[PDB]
Structure 1
Amino acid sequence: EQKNAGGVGELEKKAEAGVQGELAEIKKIAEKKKDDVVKILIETVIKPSAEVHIN
């Protein structure tokens, strides 16, 4: 039981390492594409479409 409890810190360290590894890529992608995404969303919101749903 003590040996099982010995790896609690090691498992937490591995989980934190994996979380940080994923978060690095996530933050990098977000920083790289945030301006483009915001521009696309602003263009979509500011430009409406006029149509009649009868046809």
Structure 2
Amino acid sequence: LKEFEQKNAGGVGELEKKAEAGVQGELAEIKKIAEKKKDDVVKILIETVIKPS
């Protein structure tokens, strides 16, 4: 039971570790893809907001 408690605690540490580990790549790729076309998005939004409807 105590060993199961140790495996559950180490399981918690490994849980936070693995959870934080997979949170790296996607956020970086998305941040890059967004920081690429960010300016063009700003310009397109500016072109759309002032449009003479």
Report how far residue 23 of structure 1 moved.
1.0
Identity of aligned residues (%): 100
- RMSD of aligned Cα (Å): 1.1
* Structure 1 residue runs without a partner (length 5+): 50-55
- TM-score in terms of structure 2 length: 0.77
Deviations 1:1-55, CA, capped at 9 Å, x for gaps? 2211112111111111111122111111110110111111000011120xxxxxx
- TM-score in terms of structure 1 length: 0.75
* Structure 2 residue runs without a partner (length 5+): none
Structure 1 stretches of 4+ with a deviation exceeding 4 A read none
